Amino acid sequence: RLANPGSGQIQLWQFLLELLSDSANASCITWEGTNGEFKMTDPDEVARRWGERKSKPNMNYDKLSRALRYYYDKNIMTKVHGKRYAYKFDFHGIAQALQ
Amino acid sequence: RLANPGSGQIQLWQFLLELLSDSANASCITWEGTNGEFKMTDPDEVARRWGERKSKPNMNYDKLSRALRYYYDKNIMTKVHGKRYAYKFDFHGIAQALQ
Ligand code: NA
Ligand code: NA
């Protein structure tokens, strides 16, 4: 489900796209260059920023990683094996989420 | 630039995602399965539907193909070489277009 940009009601998948849209955020999250893949260069900073957006006290990587795993069975995202803090958007699921 | 779903003001890239979001449209446009790639199984029907949405008289594949080529230099889409009516979304450009 699509939210207004920069909104507190935003879902995690859209928030990550928002961070990736601005190259200035590369010290915490960056595109890998192929097929919707990205890397959290600073996963604790990504979790901190997610906590700030959702005003969720005690947001941390443990909780963020649980939230990302929820997307595996929803065709929104998968974990990329053999890399550090690497994930891949599923744009087949996100195309529906736009509707 | 993101438009309201199903709107007449929609841009071509978003309209194609709208058609791809519904498997019922596979007789004219379908996902290939990898990396944002899709195939127009009926390019004349895709052009007809685009013409109907934009109420553009004499919309045809020639004009649609010109419109798609415009996206090559904008990091929105490329043509997929060695396939029939195959294109690939660039989700790096589309992530910005969401903002
Ligand atoms: Na946003
Ligand atoms: Na739409």
UniProtKB/Swiss-Prot annotation, chains A, B:
Protein family according to the UniProt entry: Belongs to the ETS family.
Outcome following mutation: Y72C: In BDPLT21; loss of function in positive regulation of DNA-templated transcription
Subcellular location: Nucleus
Additional information: Located on a fragment of chromosome 11 flanked on the centromeric side by the acute lymphoblastic leukemia-associated t(4;11)(q21;q23) translocation breakpoint and on the telomeric side by the Ewing- and neuroepithelioma-associated t(11;22) (q24;q12) breakpoint.
The organism's taxonomic lineage, starting at the top: Eukaryota, Metazoa, Chordata, Craniata, Vertebrata
Quaternary structure annotation from Swiss-Prot or TrEMBL: Can form homodimers or heterodimers with ETV6/TEL1.
DNA-binding region: 10-90
Origin superkingdom: Eukaryota
Annotated protein name in UniProt: Friend leukemia integration 1 transcription factor
Function: Sequence-specific transcriptional activator. Recognizes the DNA sequence 5'-C[CA]GGAAGT-3'.
Involvement in disorder: Ewing sarcoma: A highly malignant, metastatic, primitive small round cell tumor of bone and soft tissue that affects children and adolescents. It belongs to the Ewing sarcoma family of tumors, a group of morphologically heterogeneous neoplasms that share the same cytogenetic features. They are considered neural tumors derived from cells of the neural crest. Ewing sarcoma represents the less differentiated form of the tumors. Bleeding disorder, platelet-type, 21: A disorder characterized by increased bleeding tendency due to platelet dysfunction. Clinical features include epistaxis, hematomas, bleeding after tooth extraction, and menorrhagia. BDPLT21 patients may have mild to moderate thrombocytopenia.
Naturally occurring in which organism (per UniProt): Homo sapiens
Segment forming the signal sequence: none
